[PDB]
C-alpha cells in the first residue's frame, strides 16, 4: 500500500468473463452490484496458455527454453492461437490437411511452422486436466455459476454473457462457449430429448474495445 502513493502522484494533472494475463473469473451482476455469494474463480488465464503452448511446441520438435522465450512464444500466441469449435473436427483437420499450418518468423530470423497446437493450447481452458489441475473449465464453470445462483431470472443471465480482457479474443471462442454451454444446458437439464433445446436462449458477448470507462451521474 505504501507503494501506491508513487503511482497516484507523478501522473496527472449480466455474466462477465475477464481474462487479462494472470487469470479469468466469471462475474455475474444483479441490479447495480456483483454477487458476493457467487463470482467463482477459474485458476487459468493467458500465462497458462503460453506455457502450455511452449510444452506443446516442444512435443512438435521445437525446443524452446522455458524461462527464456516466454515473451516470444507469448507474442506467437496472440496472432495464431485460437479456440477450436469442435475438437474432433479440428484434430481431423490437423491430421488430414495442412490448412491450419502457419509460418512464424522469430527475432533471430529463423522461421518456424506451427499447426494443430494452435487450437490445442487454448483448449486447456475447457479441459483443465490437460495441465494437471483439479479444475472445471470455463464452460462448465460458467454454466454451474448461473445455474447455482437463483431461478427468478437465470435465463436473462444466459442471454447476456460478455467476454473481456486480452485473453478472450481467441477466434471461435464465443461460438464455442455458446455451443458447449448448449451441450451443458442439455446434459444437465434433460438426460436426452434432443427436441426441446430448439427453444434455447444464450448469446456470447465480447465486442471490440478495452476502454473500461465506468461513470454515470456525478
Amino acid at each position: 500500500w505504501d507503494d501506491m502513493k508513487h503511482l497516484w502522484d507523478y501522473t496527472f494533472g449480466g455474466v462477465v468473463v475477464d481474462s487479462g494475463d494472470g487469470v479469468t473469473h466469471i462475474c455475474p451482476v444483479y441490479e447495480g452490484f456483483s454477487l458476493p455469494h457467487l463470482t467463482r474463480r477459474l485458476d487459468i488465464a493467458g500465462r497458462d496458455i503460453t506455457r502450455y503452448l511452449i510444452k506443446l511446441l516442444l512435443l512438435r520438435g521445437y525446443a524452446f527454453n522455458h524461462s527464456a522465450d516466454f515473451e516470444t512464444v507469448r507474442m506467437i500466441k496472440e496472432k495464431l492461437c485460437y479456440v477450436g469449435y469442435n475438437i474432433e473436427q479440428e484434430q481431423k483437420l490437423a491430421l488430414e490437411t495442412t490448412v491450419l499450418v502457419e509460418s512464424y518468423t522469430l527475432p533471430d530470423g529463423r522461421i518456424i511452422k506451427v499447426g494443430g497446437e494452435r487450437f490445442e493450447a487454448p483448449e486447456a481452458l475447457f479441459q483443465p486436466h490437460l495441465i494437471n489441475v483439479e479444475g472445471v473449465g470455463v464452460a462448465e464453470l460458467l454454466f454451474n455459476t448461473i445455474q447455482a445462483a437463483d431461478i427468478d431470472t437465470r435465463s436473462e443471465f444466459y442471454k447476456h454473457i460478455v467476454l473481456s480482457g486480452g485473453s478472450t479474443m481467441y477466434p471461435g471462442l464465443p461460438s464455442r462457449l455458446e455451443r458447449e454451454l448448449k451441450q451443458l444446458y442439455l446434459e444437465r437439464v434433460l438426460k436426452g430429448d434432443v427436441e426441446k433445446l430448439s427453444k434455447f436462449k444464450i448469446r456470447i458477448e465480447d465486442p471490440p474495445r478495452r476502454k473500461h470507462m465506468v461513470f454515470l451521474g456525478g
Binding site: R179, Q183, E187, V194, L197
Partner: protein, 135 residues
C-alpha cells in the same frame, strides 16, 4: 457428452417441394432405325425431387441403356439436336453413369462427354455440381 448445430434454428435444408421419364417411348423409337429420336425421348420428364433412389436409379438405368445403345459417329448428330437446357440434363446423367462401374459404360461415356460438352460448354458441368436437385 454430441452435435447441436445440426439442431440449430437458422439451419439450411433444401425443401423437396417442387415413375420417371417414359419407358415405352424408349421402345417404339428404339428403334426402326432412329437412334436420335430415342435419346430425345429418354431425356424427357426427369424425376427429381423424389427422395427415394429407386425411381431415380430407374430413370438413370434406362438413360444409360439408351446411351449404350449408340454408335460413335452418330452421337454428334443427336447431341447437336438438343437445346441449351437438354445438354445440361444429358450431362447430369453422364456424370451419374460415372458413379458406378456398369461395364464399358464409361468407355463410351467419355465420348459421350467430349461431344456433349461441345454442345453445352464447360458451364453445363458447373450446373451439375450446383444443384440441390438430384438424379
Amino acid at each position: 457428452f454430441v452435435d447441436v448445430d445440426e439442431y440449430d434454428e437458422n439451419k439450411f435444408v433444401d425443401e423437396d417441394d417442387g415413375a420417371g421419364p417414359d419407358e415405352g417411348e424408349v421402345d417404339s423409337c428404339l428403334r426402326q432405325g432412329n437412334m436420335t429420336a430415342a435419346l430425345q425421348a429418354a431425356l424427357k420428364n426427369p424425376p427429381i425431387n423424389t427422395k427415394s433412389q429407386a425411381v431415380k436409379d430407374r430413370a438413370g438405368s434406362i438413360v444409360l441403356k439408351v446411351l449404350i445403345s449408340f454408335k460413335a459417329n452418330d452421337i454428334e448428330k443427336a447431341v447437336q439436336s438438343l437445346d441449351k437446357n437438354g445438354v445440361d440434363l444429358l450431362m447430369k446423367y453422364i456424370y451419374k453413369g460415372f458413379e458406378s462401374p456398369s461395364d464399358n459404360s464409361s468407355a463410351v461415356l467419355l465420348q459421350w462427354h467430349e461431344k456433349a460438352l461441345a454442345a453445352g460448354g464447360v458451364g453445363s458441368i458447373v450446373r451439375v455440381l450446383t444443384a440441390r436437385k438430384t438424379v
